[PDB]
Amino acid sequence: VIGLILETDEILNKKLRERKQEELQLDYNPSTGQSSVLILDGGMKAKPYSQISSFKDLDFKEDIEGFNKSICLAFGVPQVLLDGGNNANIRPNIELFYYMT
Amino acid sequence: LNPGQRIIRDMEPVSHRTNRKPFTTGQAYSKIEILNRTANMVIDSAAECSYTVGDKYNIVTYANGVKTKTLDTLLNVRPNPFMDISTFRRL
């Protein structure tokens, strides 16, 4: 994860560059820091980057639910017994499980 | 007798197997859960049912001289001297 990308076309003193990387990161965090405004001098720019691979494309709920349901189907245990439900769901499912399986 | 049984015989002298892919059948049964469960359900439900021998119809049959008690024992209790009733029904 990245918060800010700043670009310059000159070789600006690697050591103090890393020091400023630490300083900005600590200062601009609202949990530990009280700064909000940044001023760029000397020609340093800010690249408007985006996020390439997010965690919202990985929607794995339906597949995992399907695998669990298919395993329960294979053994024969009704899903209501594992999850739990209302009385009309509780007792007939218990009878069906015991008898049929 | 039927005057046209010879034509029906000539149309199909012998039976044809309709289970085209036995090996694929076995592999699918052995490695996929929605087939194993359904097939086992059908076979077990069919094997659970019993049978009752009742009245005797006054017709000439292929096998004659068999009493009601013997049929009751064969269909319900133990068909073969060497095999289970449940195994026989499931097979």
PDB file of C-alpha atoms in Angstrom:
ATOM      1  CA  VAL A   1       0.000   0.000   0.000  1.00  0.00           C
ATOM      2  CA  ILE A   2       1.239   3.495  -0.880  1.00  0.00           C
ATOM      3  CA  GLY A   3       0.071   6.875   0.353  1.00  0.00           C
ATOM      4  CA  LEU A   4       2.087   9.446  -1.596  1.00  0.00           C
ATOM      5  CA  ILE A   5       4.361   9.362  -4.650  1.00  0.00           C
ATOM      6  CA  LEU A   6       6.644  12.354  -5.253  1.00  0.00           C
ATOM      7  CA  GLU A   7       8.781  12.611  -8.393  1.00  0.00           C
ATOM      8  CA  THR A   8      11.895  14.688  -9.088  1.00  0.00           C
ATOM      9  CA  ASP A   9      14.284  14.758 -12.052  1.00  0.00           C
ATOM     10  CA  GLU A  10      17.473  15.346 -10.026  1.00  0.00           C
ATOM     11  CA  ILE A  11      19.698  13.372  -7.658  1.00  0.00           C
ATOM     12  CA  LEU A  12      18.726  14.808  -4.275  1.00  0.00           C
ATOM     13  CA  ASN A  13      20.969  13.313  -1.590  1.00  0.00           C
ATOM     14  CA  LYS A  14      19.691   9.758  -0.939  1.00  0.00           C
ATOM     15  CA  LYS A  15      20.277   9.989   2.829  1.00  0.00           C
ATOM     16  CA  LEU A  16      18.227  13.141   3.415  1.00  0.00           C
ATOM     17  CA  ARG A  17      15.696  11.767   0.927  1.00  0.00           C
ATOM     18  CA  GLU A  18      15.135   8.765   3.204  1.00  0.00           C
ATOM     19  CA  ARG A  19      15.040  11.073   6.227  1.00  0.00           C
ATOM     20  CA  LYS A  20      12.276  13.107   4.569  1.00  0.00           C
ATOM     21  CA  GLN A  21      10.452   9.883   3.669  1.00  0.00           C
ATOM     22  CA  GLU A  22      10.375   8.990   7.363  1.00  0.00           C
ATOM     23  CA  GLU A  23       9.487  12.548   8.403  1.00  0.00           C
ATOM     24  CA  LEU A  24       6.496  12.978   6.084  1.00  0.00           C
ATOM     25  CA  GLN A  25       5.157   9.507   6.889  1.00  0.00           C
ATOM     26  CA  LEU A  26       5.256  10.187  10.625  1.00  0.00           C
ATOM     27  CA  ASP A  27       3.993  13.777  10.416  1.00  0.00           C
ATOM     28  CA  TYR A  28       1.015  13.251   8.112  1.00  0.00           C
ATOM     29  CA  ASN A  29      -0.534  10.304   9.952  1.00  0.00           C
ATOM     30  CA  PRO A  30      -3.590  11.679  11.804  1.00  0.00           C
ATOM     31  CA  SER A  31      -3.119   9.131  14.605  1.00  0.00           C
ATOM     32  CA  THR A  32       0.366  10.496  15.417  1.00  0.00           C
ATOM     33  CA  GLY A  33       0.781  13.886  13.761  1.00  0.00           C
ATOM     34  CA  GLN A  34      -0.856  17.269  13.349  1.00  0.00           C
ATOM     35  CA  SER A  35      -0.127  18.317   9.756  1.00  0.00           C
ATOM     36  CA  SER A  36      -2.361  18.360   6.687  1.00  0.00           C
ATOM     37  CA  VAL A  37      -0.807  20.802   4.190  1.00  0.00           C
ATOM     38  CA  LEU A  38       2.229  20.094   1.997  1.00  0.00           C
ATOM     39  CA  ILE A  39       4.253  22.618  -0.023  1.00  0.00           C
ATOM     40  CA  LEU A  40       6.494  21.456  -2.888  1.00  0.00           C
ATOM     41  CA  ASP A  41       9.499  23.646  -3.695  1.00  0.00           C
ATOM     42  CA  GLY A  42      12.425  23.242  -6.058  1.00  0.00           C
ATOM     43  CA  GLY A  43      10.416  21.482  -8.774  1.00  0.00           C
ATOM     44  CA  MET A  44       9.318  18.335  -6.939  1.00  0.00           C
ATOM     45  CA  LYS A  45       6.030  17.006  -8.327  1.00  0.00           C
ATOM     46  CA  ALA A  46       3.357  14.538  -7.190  1.00  0.00           C
ATOM     47  CA  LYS A  47       2.317  11.644  -9.409  1.00  0.00           C
ATOM     48  CA  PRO A  48      -1.421  10.848  -9.160  1.00  0.00           C
ATOM     49  CA  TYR A  49      -1.048   7.080  -8.835  1.00  0.00           C
ATOM     50  CA  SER A  50      -3.856   4.540  -8.465  1.00  0.00           C
ATOM     51  CA  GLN A  51      -4.275   1.017  -7.065  1.00  0.00           C
ATOM     52  CA  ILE A  52      -3.586  -1.847  -9.461  1.00  0.00           C
ATOM     53  CA  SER A  53      -4.708  -4.968  -7.570  1.00  0.00           C
ATOM     54  CA  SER A  54      -7.369  -4.420  -4.909  1.00  0.00           C
ATOM     55  CA  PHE A  55      -8.945  -6.800  -2.391  1.00  0.00           C
ATOM     56  CA  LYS A  56     -12.470  -6.304  -3.778  1.00  0.00           C
ATOM     57  CA  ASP A  57     -11.855  -8.381  -6.911  1.00  0.00           C
ATOM     58  CA  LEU A  58     -11.239 -11.442  -4.719  1.00  0.00           C
ATOM     59  CA  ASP A  59     -14.866 -12.393  -3.991  1.00  0.00           C
ATOM     60  CA  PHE A  60     -14.488 -15.897  -2.552  1.00  0.00           C
ATOM     61  CA  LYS A  61     -17.667 -16.122  -0.450  1.00  0.00           C
ATOM     62  CA  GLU A  62     -19.871 -17.915  -2.981  1.00  0.00           C
ATOM     63  CA  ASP A  63     -17.292 -20.552  -3.933  1.00  0.00           C
ATOM     64  CA  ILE A  64     -16.456 -21.417  -0.315  1.00  0.00           C
ATOM     65  CA  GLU A  65     -20.151 -21.584   0.571  1.00  0.00           C
ATOM     66  CA  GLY A  66     -20.702 -23.894  -2.393  1.00  0.00           C
ATOM     67  CA  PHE A  67     -17.864 -26.190  -1.337  1.00  0.00           C
ATOM     68  CA  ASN A  68     -19.167 -26.384   2.242  1.00  0.00           C
ATOM     69  CA  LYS A  69     -22.723 -27.067   1.062  1.00  0.00           C
ATOM     70  CA  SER A  70     -21.474 -29.748  -1.329  1.00  0.00           C
ATOM     71  CA  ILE A  71     -19.520 -31.485   1.447  1.00  0.00           C
ATOM     72  CA  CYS A  72     -22.582 -31.421   3.710  1.00  0.00           C
ATOM     73  CA  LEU A  73     -24.597 -32.829   0.799  1.00  0.00           C
ATOM     74  CA  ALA A  74     -22.041 -35.608   0.311  1.00  0.00           C
ATOM     75  CA  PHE A  75     -22.200 -36.740   3.927  1.00  0.00           C
ATOM     76  CA  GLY A  76     -25.940 -36.138   4.188  1.00  0.00           C
ATOM     77  CA  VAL A  77     -26.123 -33.810   7.187  1.00  0.00           C
ATOM     78  CA  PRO A  78     -28.808 -31.142   6.635  1.00  0.00           C
ATOM     79  CA  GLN A  79     -27.458 -27.598   6.666  1.00  0.00           C
ATOM     80  CA  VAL A  80     -30.012 -26.529   9.285  1.00  0.00           C
ATOM     81  CA  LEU A  81     -28.494 -28.887  11.857  1.00  0.00           C
ATOM     82  CA  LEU A  82     -25.104 -27.213  11.401  1.00  0.00           C
ATOM     83  CA  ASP A  83     -26.470 -23.656  11.356  1.00  0.00           C
ATOM     84  CA  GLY A  84     -29.543 -23.905  13.581  1.00  0.00           C
ATOM     85  CA  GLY A  85     -33.001 -22.482  13.065  1.00  0.00           C
ATOM     86  CA  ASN A  86     -36.614 -22.351  14.178  1.00  0.00           C
ATOM     87  CA  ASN A  87     -38.468 -25.254  15.805  1.00  0.00           C
ATOM     88  CA  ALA A  88     -40.104 -26.310  12.529  1.00  0.00           C
ATOM     89  CA  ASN A  89     -36.580 -26.269  11.102  1.00  0.00           C
ATOM     90  CA  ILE A  90     -35.077 -28.056  14.112  1.00  0.00           C
ATOM     91  CA  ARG A  91     -37.202 -31.152  14.658  1.00  0.00           C
ATOM     92  CA  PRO A  92     -38.159 -32.295  11.109  1.00  0.00           C
ATOM     93  CA  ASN A  93     -34.542 -31.885   9.989  1.00  0.00           C
ATOM     94  CA  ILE A  94     -33.331 -33.992  12.929  1.00  0.00           C
ATOM     95  CA  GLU A  95     -35.825 -36.722  12.031  1.00  0.00           C
ATOM     96  CA  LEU A  96     -34.910 -36.555   8.334  1.00  0.00           C
ATOM     97  CA  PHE A  97     -31.187 -36.749   9.093  1.00  0.00           C
ATOM     98  CA  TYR A  98     -31.414 -39.688  11.494  1.00  0.00           C
ATOM     99  CA  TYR A  99     -33.876 -41.707   9.413  1.00  0.00           C
ATOM    100  CA  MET A 100     -32.676 -41.138   5.854  1.00  0.00           C
ATOM    101  CA  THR A 101     -28.930 -41.127   6.509  1.00  0.00           C
TER     102      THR A 101
ATOM    103  CA  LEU B   1     -49.634 -66.186 -31.634  1.00  0.00           C
ATOM    104  CA  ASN B   2     -48.704 -62.870 -33.226  1.00  0.00           C
ATOM    105  CA  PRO B   3     -48.532 -63.276 -37.030  1.00  0.00           C
ATOM    106  CA  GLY B   4     -45.894 -60.543 -37.275  1.00  0.00           C
ATOM    107  CA  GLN B   5     -43.417 -61.519 -34.569  1.00  0.00           C
ATOM    108  CA  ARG B   6     -40.855 -62.486 -37.226  1.00  0.00           C
ATOM    109  CA  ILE B   7     -40.753 -58.895 -38.493  1.00  0.00           C
ATOM    110  CA  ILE B   8     -40.181 -57.556 -34.973  1.00  0.00           C
ATOM    111  CA  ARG B   9     -37.408 -60.116 -34.477  1.00  0.00           C
ATOM    112  CA  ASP B  10     -35.766 -59.058 -37.746  1.00  0.00           C
ATOM    113  CA  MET B  11     -35.963 -55.409 -36.673  1.00  0.00           C
ATOM    114  CA  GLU B  12     -33.871 -56.123 -33.544  1.00  0.00           C
ATOM    115  CA  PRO B  13     -32.631 -59.717 -33.084  1.00  0.00           C
ATOM    116  CA  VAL B  14     -30.511 -58.951 -30.002  1.00  0.00           C
ATOM    117  CA  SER B  15     -30.320 -56.381 -27.227  1.00  0.00           C
ATOM    118  CA  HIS B  16     -28.049 -53.327 -27.306  1.00  0.00           C
ATOM    119  CA  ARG B  17     -26.061 -51.951 -24.385  1.00  0.00           C
ATOM    120  CA  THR B  18     -27.137 -48.413 -23.494  1.00  0.00           C
ATOM    121  CA  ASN B  19     -24.379 -47.564 -20.978  1.00  0.00           C
ATOM    122  CA  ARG B  20     -21.976 -46.153 -23.544  1.00  0.00           C
ATOM    123  CA  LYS B  21     -19.299 -44.954 -21.116  1.00  0.00           C
ATOM    124  CA  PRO B  22     -18.785 -47.360 -18.187  1.00  0.00           C
ATOM    125  CA  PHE B  23     -15.307 -46.175 -17.170  1.00  0.00           C
ATOM    126  CA  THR B  24     -16.374 -42.524 -17.143  1.00  0.00           C
ATOM    127  CA  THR B  25     -19.431 -43.591 -15.138  1.00  0.00           C
ATOM    128  CA  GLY B  26     -17.237 -45.282 -12.543  1.00  0.00           C
ATOM    129  CA  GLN B  27     -14.835 -42.348 -12.329  1.00  0.00           C
ATOM    130  CA  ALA B  28     -17.667 -39.831 -11.931  1.00  0.00           C
ATOM    131  CA  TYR B  29     -19.299 -41.998  -9.263  1.00  0.00           C
ATOM    132  CA  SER B  30     -15.983 -42.347  -7.430  1.00  0.00           C
ATOM    133  CA  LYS B  31     -14.891 -38.695  -7.617  1.00  0.00           C
ATOM    134  CA  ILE B  32     -18.019 -36.417  -7.576  1.00  0.00           C
ATOM    135  CA  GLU B  33     -20.304 -35.797  -4.571  1.00  0.00           C
ATOM    136  CA  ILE B  34     -23.661 -34.797  -6.156  1.00  0.00           C
ATOM    137  CA  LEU B  35     -23.709 -38.159  -8.084  1.00  0.00           C
ATOM    138  CA  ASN B  36     -22.606 -40.422  -5.232  1.00  0.00           C
ATOM    139  CA  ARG B  37     -25.159 -38.959  -2.823  1.00  0.00           C
ATOM    140  CA  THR B  38     -28.096 -39.128  -5.241  1.00  0.00           C
ATOM    141  CA  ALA B  39     -27.299 -42.660  -6.434  1.00  0.00           C
ATOM    142  CA  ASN B  40     -26.853 -43.911  -2.865  1.00  0.00           C
ATOM    143  CA  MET B  41     -30.119 -42.244  -1.843  1.00  0.00           C
ATOM    144  CA  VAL B  42     -32.032 -43.949  -4.656  1.00  0.00           C
ATOM    145  CA  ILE B  43     -30.483 -47.379  -4.062  1.00  0.00           C
ATOM    146  CA  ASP B  44     -30.943 -47.306  -0.280  1.00  0.00           C
ATOM    147  CA  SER B  45     -34.532 -46.058  -0.555  1.00  0.00           C
ATOM    148  CA  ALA B  46     -35.350 -48.824  -3.039  1.00  0.00           C
ATOM    149  CA  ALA B  47     -33.677 -51.473  -0.866  1.00  0.00           C
ATOM    150  CA  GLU B  48     -35.532 -50.335   2.269  1.00  0.00           C
ATOM    151  CA  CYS B  49     -38.908 -51.423   0.877  1.00  0.00           C
ATOM    152  CA  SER B  50     -40.166 -54.923   1.685  1.00  0.00           C
ATOM    153  CA  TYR B  51     -42.482 -57.205  -0.331  1.00  0.00           C
ATOM    154  CA  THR B  52     -45.756 -59.023   0.372  1.00  0.00           C
ATOM    155  CA  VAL B  53     -47.013 -62.202  -1.312  1.00  0.00           C
ATOM    156  CA  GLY B  54     -50.796 -62.433  -1.394  1.00  0.00           C
ATOM    157  CA  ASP B  55     -53.414 -64.256  -3.443  1.00  0.00           C
ATOM    158  CA  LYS B  56     -52.636 -66.816  -6.142  1.00  0.00           C
ATOM    159  CA  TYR B  57     -53.728 -66.105  -9.714  1.00  0.00           C
ATOM    160  CA  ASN B  58     -55.039 -69.178 -11.533  1.00  0.00           C
ATOM    161  CA  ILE B  59     -52.699 -68.993 -14.539  1.00  0.00           C
ATOM    162  CA  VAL B  60     -49.962 -71.236 -15.910  1.00  0.00           C
ATOM    163  CA  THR B  61     -46.559 -69.823 -14.978  1.00  0.00           C
ATOM    164  CA  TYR B  62     -42.902 -70.466 -15.754  1.00  0.00           C
ATOM    165  CA  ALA B  63     -42.193 -71.616 -12.174  1.00  0.00           C
ATOM    166  CA  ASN B  64     -44.866 -73.725 -10.472  1.00  0.00           C
ATOM    167  CA  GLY B  65     -45.117 -75.666  -7.235  1.00  0.00           C
ATOM    168  CA  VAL B  66     -43.843 -72.813  -5.041  1.00  0.00           C
ATOM    169  CA  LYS B  67     -45.671 -72.120  -1.778  1.00  0.00           C
ATOM    170  CA  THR B  68     -46.430 -68.694  -0.331  1.00  0.00           C
ATOM    171  CA  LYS B  69     -44.128 -69.138   2.672  1.00  0.00           C
ATOM    172  CA  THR B  70     -41.122 -69.903   0.465  1.00  0.00           C
ATOM    173  CA  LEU B  71     -41.687 -66.726  -1.562  1.00  0.00           C
ATOM    174  CA  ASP B  72     -42.125 -64.734   1.646  1.00  0.00           C
ATOM    175  CA  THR B  73     -38.806 -66.051   2.967  1.00  0.00           C
ATOM    176  CA  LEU B  74     -36.975 -65.473  -0.326  1.00  0.00           C
ATOM    177  CA  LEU B  75     -38.191 -61.935  -1.012  1.00  0.00           C
ATOM    178  CA  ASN B  76     -38.005 -60.751   2.603  1.00  0.00           C
ATOM    179  CA  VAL B  77     -35.716 -62.872   4.777  1.00  0.00           C
ATOM    180  CA  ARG B  78     -32.844 -64.396   2.771  1.00  0.00           C
ATOM    181  CA  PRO B  79     -32.953 -65.085  -0.994  1.00  0.00           C
ATOM    182  CA  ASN B  80     -29.685 -66.970  -1.376  1.00  0.00           C
ATOM    183  CA  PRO B  81     -28.229 -69.376   1.194  1.00  0.00           C
ATOM    184  CA  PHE B  82     -24.971 -67.410   0.828  1.00  0.00           C
ATOM    185  CA  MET B  83     -26.007 -63.767   0.327  1.00  0.00           C
ATOM    186  CA  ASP B  84     -27.798 -61.043   2.267  1.00  0.00           C
ATOM    187  CA  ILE B  85     -31.243 -59.729   1.406  1.00  0.00           C
ATOM    188  CA  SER B  86     -29.965 -56.148   1.584  1.00  0.00           C
ATOM    189  CA  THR B  87     -26.984 -56.894  -0.663  1.00  0.00           C
ATOM    190  CA  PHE B  88     -29.218 -58.719  -3.153  1.00  0.00           C
ATOM    191  CA  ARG B  89     -31.731 -55.863  -3.302  1.00  0.00           C
ATOM    192  CA  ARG B  90     -29.028 -53.200  -3.610  1.00  0.00           C
ATOM    193  CA  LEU B  91     -27.284 -55.130  -6.391  1.00  0.00           C
TER     194      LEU B  91
END
